[PDB]
Amino acid sequence: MTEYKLVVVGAGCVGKSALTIQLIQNHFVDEYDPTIEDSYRKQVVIDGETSLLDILDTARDQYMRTGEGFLLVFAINNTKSFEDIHHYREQIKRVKDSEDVPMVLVGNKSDLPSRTVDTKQAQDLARSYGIPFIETSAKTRQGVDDAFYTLVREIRKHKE
Ligand SMILES: *CCC(=O)N[C@H]1CCCN(C(=O)O[C@H]2[C@@H](O)[C@H](n3cnc4c(=O)[nH]c(N)nc43)O[C@@H]2COP(=O)(O)OP(=O)(O)O)C1
Ligand SMILES: [Mg+2]
């Protein structure tokens, strides 16, 4: 089976861990330790192809070198976390020495009403980067599979 090393990055408290845990364990862990940086593995079938996902939940430079695709996560109720996205993307470009790195922009906490980052803002940013944008809720699981599977599809497109 093919293996994909994915890396989840973004400001603190945006939901990187909650998203990863939903993908791996299929439940919403609300109070997860904010300091645990670790990799999780799960065998899934994506578009009929069996894949082993090796996902690093960031909170280290060994996985930025080996990571094949990156989830850029902000929270839709956290303007600063969206402003920080550019920093994370630039840091990945620097380590990869490349402008063509599979990435997906993720706007998490879509269940909340207290939104300060417009969907149009995020779509504008993703368009500028040339990457997909997916809105998620780790709480309700909305969009969680879509975010990670979309990233795998971008790595597959990249390799082909
Ligand atoms: C950082 C400030 C903060 O959120 N403080 C606390 C007060 C008490 C506990 N509570 C909490 O644990 O929030 C977690 C988590 O439940 C929440 N979260 C994550 N994803 C979602 C989502 O999709 N919808 C909603 N309504 N809440 C979500 O946010 C924090 C942080 O989650 P995390 O540890 O996964 O974030 P990481 O630092 O990026 O890993 C709020
Ligand atoms: Mg975390």
Numbering used by the authors: 1 to 59, 68 to 168
Task: Copy text from the publication.
Kirsten rat sarcoma (KRAS) is one of the most prominent oncogenes in human tumors, found in approximately 30 % of cases. Oncogenic mutations in KRAS cause a shift of equilibrium from the inactive guanosine diphosphate (GDP)-bound state to the active guanosine triphosphate (GTP)-bound state, thereby amplifying proliferative signaling pathways and promoting uncontrolled cell growth. Within this subset, 6 % feature a glycine-to-cysteine substitution (KRASG13C), presenting a potential anchor point for the design of covalent inhibitors.
In this study, we report the synthesis, reactivity, and structural profiling of novel compounds featuring cyclic aliphatic linkers. Interestingly, three molecules of RAS were found in the asymmetric unit, with the orientation of the linker near the covalently modified Cys13 modeled differently in these 3 instances, and the electron density less well-defined than in the remaining molecule. However, it also suggests that pre-organization of the linker still needs to be optimized by further rigidification to contribute to an efficient covalent reaction. Upon modification of the protein with the covalent nucleotide analogs, no nucleotide exchange was observed for compounds 7a and 7b, including the linear and cyclic linkers, respectively, that showed the highest reactivities in the previous experiments. In contrast, KRASG13C covalently modified with molecules 7a and 7b cannot become activated in the presence of GppNHp and SOS and consequently did not interact with the Raf RBD.
